[PDB]
From a paper:
One nucleosome contains an AP site in a solvent-exposed rotational orientation near the nucleosome entry/exit site at SHL−6, referred to as AP-NCP−6. Importantly, APE1 cleavage activity was not observed for ND-NCPs, confirming the cleavage specificity of APE1 for nucleosomal AP sites. Together, these pre-steady state kinetic measurements indicate that APE1 rapidly cleaves solvent-exposed AP sites at the nucleosome entry/exit site (AP-NCP−6). To determine if APE1 sculpts nucleosomal DNA, we obtained a 3.0 Å cryo-EM reconstruction of the AP-NCP-6 in the absence of APE1. Comparison of the APE1-AP-NCP-6 and AP-NCP-6 structures revealed significant distortion of the nucleosomal DNA upon APE1 binding. Structural comparison of the AP-NCP-6, AP-NCP-6.5, and AP-NCP0 revealed minimal changes to the overall structure of the nucleosome, indicating the three different AP sites do not induce large-scale conformational changes in the nucleosome. The AP site at SHL-6 is completely solvent-exposed and no direct contacts between the histone octamer and damaged strand of the nucleosomal DNA are observed.
The nucleosome consists of ~147 bp of DNA wrapped around a core octameric histone protein complex, containing two copies each of histone H2A, H2B, H3, and H41. One of the most common forms of DNA damage is the baseless sugar moiety known as apurinic/apyrimidinic (AP) sites, with an estimated ~10,000 AP sites generated in each cell per day. The primary enzyme tasked with locating and processing genomic AP sites is the multifunctional nuclease AP endonuclease 1 (APE1), which is a key component of the base excision repair (BER) pathway. During BER, APE1 functions as an AP-endonuclease by cleaving the DNA phosphodiester backbone 5′ of the AP site generating a 5′-nicked BER intermediate.
Numbering used by the authors:
A (entry chain G): 15 to 117
B (entry chain B): 24 to 101
C (entry chain H): 33 to 125
D (entry chain A), H (entry chain E): 38 to 134
E (entry chain D): 32 to 124
F (entry chain C): 11 to 118
G (entry chain F): 21 to 101
DNA sequence: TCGGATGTATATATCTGACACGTGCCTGGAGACTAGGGAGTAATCCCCTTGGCGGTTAAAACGCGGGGGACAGCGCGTACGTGCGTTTAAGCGGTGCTAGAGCTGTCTACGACCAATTGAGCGGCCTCGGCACCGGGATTCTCGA
DNA sequence: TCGAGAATCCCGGTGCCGAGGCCGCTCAATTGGTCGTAGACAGCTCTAGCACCGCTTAAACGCACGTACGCGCTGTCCCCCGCGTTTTAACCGCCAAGGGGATTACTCCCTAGTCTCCAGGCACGTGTCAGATATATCATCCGA
């Protein structure tokens, strides 16, 4: 019955519709806008989580921590471009030493 | 005098994480100036949000909004 | 009562990695990322609807906002998934 | 005896603080600095723990990014040692000054 | 159709500031673009301020806080003094 | 019904208050809009316009020009510190640049 | 069609832009560097301008599309529109 | 016979192009380049003259700010001639690379 | 370039406190049904964008000295690392306690909405004055002496 | 220093086009009511921010010591600038057309609004194991 299962998604289409209606974005909100936005959000979340799981596995760890999210975001050209101006707390930095400093 | 609590080794450690090999002496003050300016800019908007909210405590959401206003979005606190 | 995306972010994680877990700090970061992207796309769609003297956010506005926001391959894949989801939603009544 | 040659320990501690995710700054001194700065805007202010922590995480990330740009500005001048003019150039180009 | 522009009011302000100074069409268009940009900037900041505090109305205090947040230094200290002085004059019919 | 008195003249302003109320109501900013919000916003906008026009007219007078052109607006905005900070990510069309030659380049 | 019009941004035009920028002496590779920086900037702006145009179901790129595309990247051109 | 020395005819024209408010780029070549670039996004587009003018103003403002930062970077390295590495450093610090 | 000696990974016991899982319930999401207004489709108008040809000439492309600045190499001395001894204050784990953050119940004043009413501002039309342009004279810089 | 020579400013005269004022008239701002509800105000609770205190010990600080690197100086040369000549294509004007961007008209169907029902996800509690820590066991780098 839930619109998330009717569209084959996992994010809540109903909650997204409620937030779109109560968010002061437009006078009225269409019927497929929540479905489209929930699909896009779920796709981006899946991309982030699949990239962070690889980083967590490369560290012999079965749990995702902020450092793994930072590695996944900074090692992807497009995710780092979408989140260029974002700071991840407890995420550290990307290991990068300039060649000039090396002996 | 609390700006001296940001010691020389702390600035050196931040530089090392930033990939720095050698540091001049005047950096340990040129960096305190920048840190103080940045903190003043962020805390001004945080306290503005706090005052508008009719509150006397600065919640983490006020700092998050003040940072998001300056382009430095922060993930992890709300 | 406070509403978060923890349940859905955890379900997606079980989809993509059935053998890994996610910490509390990472869940907070994922909620802050989802909220930020939602706000970005919704604001862009609102501005798009305002520019054209319309008063309705539709799949057209959300798709154009996604194309404007996300980079090339990310935007193309997001548009494809959104169109597929809208089509499935519509046909299944 | 085994004085690690000048520059070699400096090569280290970079691989140490880029692998770690800690704060690198003492927390009570930073809280005191935050309160002293905030006195100039409103008296008798109380701060939330998640607010001082948020300020610390934001400021340290800002300083690390500034030092990353400053190192490039210093390498550009065919140098290895950062001088304050390198910080001023980075701030001016970034738009802060 | 009729396009609305702040030309009349900007010209009135110019003539009360500089009685014997004109203004070209391109400078008038730039002043209209500046006024629109600042209007939308302050209005968006006030909307976000109202949303953050779970309010449902934009009062003069949200505009005051938006002006304080957006205008730098001595400019905000003077703009707040004009806004309050105008609101006081308004509410004494 | 009495004689019609505009809200922008009752408050003493020159910018319109009814138009600002209408733009705040049809702008999807909030569900409701208070009575004093348009007055405050119109006063702020009028002050900010007068502040720029003062320096623009001053710049025009310094150039022996009766009328204000975009070059004078750019000269007014870039010279003043706070106007430059407010409009630092803004491009004024046909405004040129502020004359600034670096001291190193000058001849000896 | 149209091809290789990036050379229409001649060397004198780049030198005049540098002179207005306050540059006293120019190298010989600055021209090729600038003709590749300008192309990237123009592609980035025109992608969003054409997106705005296509959304409105139009075939002409109006000045408002360019203004909105510029404001999207935080550049806020005053003047047109 | 009266030849100006290499370091004067160039500050001259610096003063000239900083005093003026012109475009400094030919208009037909820029329009042609804009159309060529836009062919990759939608075939058979009809640019509005105001759009082509706004594109030119924005592009030259960007190229003047970039050259200001390039001049600053080239002066930082104790040089007068701007090099492509100066442009690279300016864009890297600005956050465009 | 191997000998001595540091500072990383590697392997194992041992907690423990976050993580994932029952649970139940209550609030928000479905499901049906109605009204009406946004917008989608059709047709039309005209305006403004594309396309073209001719004449000027301002500007770009070219080629040639030549000087000045970028680059490389040498040298010096200083200031910034490296390590050792100390001492200073940061954590940490308790205590108490009290401001004030957060949630609830009235109920009152304020903002939305609607129905005439009209004057402010938007559109169209001169027009003369501010500004651009040219011609020449006076003023200022410049560079080889 | 000095004066010929080029660049620039000033001063005036002429033309020209747009900034500004005036008239007509819409339609959006004003006035005056009702009505519903958002939040102002008082009040209560409980929680977490603050203050303190002892103790341990990790980190900061100060001081030799040395070496390597930033900065100044000198020499080369090469490459960029100033200038004169030759294209050349921008640019202005003036024409023609037709594509499509703005309008209105109509109607229809899609979304808001409301009532009713129910399920899922949000606090809450609990076992338990992923990972952090103490302890012992090979890449590299410093010196003849």
């Amino acid at each position: 019955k839930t619109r998330s299962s009717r569209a084959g998604l996992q994010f809540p289409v109903g909650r997204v519709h409620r937030l779109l209606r109560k968010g002061n974005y437009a006078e009225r909100v269409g019927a497929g806008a929540p479905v489209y936005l929930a699909a896009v959000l779920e796709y981006l979340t899946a991309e982030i989580l699949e990239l962070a799981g690889n980083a967590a596995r490369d560290n012999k760890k079965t749990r995702i921590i902020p450092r793994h999210l930072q590695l996944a975001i900074r090692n992807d050209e497009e995710l780092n471009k979408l989140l260029g101006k974002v700071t991840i707390a407890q995420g550290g930095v990307l290991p990068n030493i300039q060649a000039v400093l090396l002996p | 005098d609390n700006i001296q609590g940001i010691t020389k080794p702390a600035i050196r450690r931040l530089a090392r994480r930033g990939g720095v090999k050698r540091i001049s002496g005047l950096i340990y003050e040129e960096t305190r100036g920048v840190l103080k300016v940045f903190l003043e800019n962020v805390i001004r908007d945080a306290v503005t949000y706090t005052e508008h909210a009719k509150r006397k405590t600065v919640t983490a959401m006020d700092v998050v909004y003040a940072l998001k206003r300056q382009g430095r979005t922060l993930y992890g606190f709300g | 009562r406070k509403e978060s995306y923890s349940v859905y972010v955890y379900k997606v994680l079980k989809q993509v990695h059935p053998d890994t877990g996610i910490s509390s700090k990472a869940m907070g970061i994922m909620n802050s990322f989802v909220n930020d992207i939602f706000e970005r796309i919704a604001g862009e769609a609102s501005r798009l609807a305002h520019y054209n003297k319309r008063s309705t956010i539709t799949s057209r506005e959300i798709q154009t906002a996604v194309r404007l926001l996300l980079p090339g391959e990310l935007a193309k894949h997001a548009v494809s998934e959104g169109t597929k989801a809208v089509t499935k939603y519509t046909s299944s009544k | 005896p085994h004085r690690y040659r000048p520059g070699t320990v400096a090569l280290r501690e970079i691989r140490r603080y880029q692998k770690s995710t800690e704060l690198l700054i003492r927390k009570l001194p930073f809280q005191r600095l935050v309160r002293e700065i905030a006195q100039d805007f409103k008296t008798d202010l109380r701060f939330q723990s998640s607010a001082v922590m948020a300020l610390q995480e934001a400021s340290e990330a800002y300083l690390v990014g500034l030092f990353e740009d400053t190192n490039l500005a210093a390498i550009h001048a065919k140098r290895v040692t950062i001088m304050p003019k390198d910080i001023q150039l980075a701030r001016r180009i970034r738009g802060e000054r």
